[PDB]
Amino acid sequence: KLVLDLERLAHVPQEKAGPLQRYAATIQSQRGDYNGKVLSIRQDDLRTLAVIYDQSPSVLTEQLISWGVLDA
Amino acid sequence: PKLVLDLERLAHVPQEKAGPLQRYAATIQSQRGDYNGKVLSIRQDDLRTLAVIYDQSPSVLTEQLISWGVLDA
Ligand SMILES: Nc1nc2c(ncn2[C@@H]2O[C@@H]3COP(=O)(O)O[C@H]4[C@@H](O)[C@H](n5cnc6c(=O)[nH]c(N)nc65)O[C@@H]4COP(=O)(O)O[C@H]3[C@H]2O)c(=O)[nH]1
Ligand SMILES: Nc1nc2c(ncn2[C@@H]2O[C@@H]3COP(=O)(O)O[C@H]4[C@@H](O)[C@H](n5cnc6c(=O)[nH]c(N)nc65)O[C@@H]4COP(=O)(O)O[C@H]3[C@H]2O)c(=O)[nH]1
Ligand SMILES: Nc1nc2c(ncn2[C@@H]2O[C@@H]3COP(=O)(O)O[C@H]4[C@@H](O)[C@H](n5cnc6c(=O)[nH]c(N)nc65)O[C@@H]4COP(=O)(O)O[C@H]3[C@H]2O)c(=O)[nH]1
Ligand SMILES: Nc1nc2c(ncn2[C@@H]2O[C@@H]3COP(=O)(O)O[C@H]4[C@@H](O)[C@H](n5cnc6c(=O)[nH]c(N)nc65)O[C@@H]4COP(=O)(O)O[C@H]3[C@H]2O)c(=O)[nH]1
């Protein structure tokens, strides 16, 4: 389950989190989902984010877990 | 049309017509743990799955769902 902590994500500097921040905003606007605390995404979004980040999905997961943004 | 289904409108649909969609609905709800209201929205791509389960065209399925009042114009 890919579950993002939105309050934490917002405080990661753009230089690390910029593309994930923008990706999450596009999901929120498509959904009209502005709950303010959590955003769960499709497993297939991980694949997409990995392409954007130029990292493997597993390395990306580790990075987001290490930022405390993604639950482990 | 966005597939926003009214599970209560659907319940008033005769079982021969409604069955497959009620079964599918129950499967999505279980996969999600989503049991908190009478509206179920599903993916646009899910219309293909339902088309296959009913062996009806997607367009035909959408039109009838709308007639049963289950789906929004
Ligand atoms: N609980 C749950 N509900 C689901 C799931 N999949 C679809 N739905 C519901 O069905 C809707 C339509 O799904 P869609 O055609 O894929 O249309 C979706 C999709 O194209 C996109 N979208 C929303 N969220 C995500 C996401 O996490 N990842 C991706 N790749 N696209 C998303 O924006 C659309 C509108 O999203 P919504 O307004 O939320 O509306 C969603 C939502 O009510 C699911 O795995 N779990
Ligand atoms: N706004 C929002 N909240 C989130 C998200 N991720 C997790 N949650 C929270 O965590 C629970 C489970 O989320 P879930 O796995 O999406 O699983 C959800 C989801 O599958 C579904 N669900 C609830 N509300 C909606 C809705 O408005 N539209 C759709 N399409 N599905 C919903 O019901 C399941 C259980 O919902 P709850 O336990 O009552 O409540 C939620 C919700 O409090 C997110 O991306 N957006
Ligand atoms: N074909 C189909 N499959 C469905 C539908 N609903 C749920 N599933 C399946 O059940 C898994 C869990 O749904 P979830 O707990 O709501 O957990 C969902 C949920 O919280 C959220 N999500 C994904 N897509 C959407 C979306 O379009 N709208 C919203 N509001 N939430 C979404 O992301 C989580 C993970 O998504 P997935 O990895 O795809 O994992 C999804 C997906 O495989 C559906 O309407 N159609
Ligand atoms: N992954 C996930 N996403 C969530 C959750 N709660 C809300 N959302 C997202 O936040 C959007 C707005 O939810 P809402 O207006 O509060 O209120 C919702 C809700 O009251 C209702 N609704 C429509 N479809 C569904 C559905 O399949 N299940 C549920 N439980 N409610 C739905 O219609 C409004 C819009 O539904 P959506 O188009 O789905 O759009 C939802 C959905 O994208 C959640 O627990 N998990």
Author numbering:
A (entry chain A): 84 to 155
B (entry chain R): 83 to 155
Quote the passages of the study that discuss this structure, keeping the authors' original sentences.
Specifically, structural and biochemical analyses show that the second messenger c-di-GMP activates BldD DNA binding by driving a unique form of dimerization that is mediated by a tetrameric form of c-di-GMP.
The guanine bases wedged between the two motif 2 regions are specified by contacts from residues Arg125 and Asp128. Rather, the c-di-GMP molecules are closely spaced and optimally positioned for interbase pairing, leading to the formation of a multistranded, base-stacked structure with top, middle, and bottom layers.
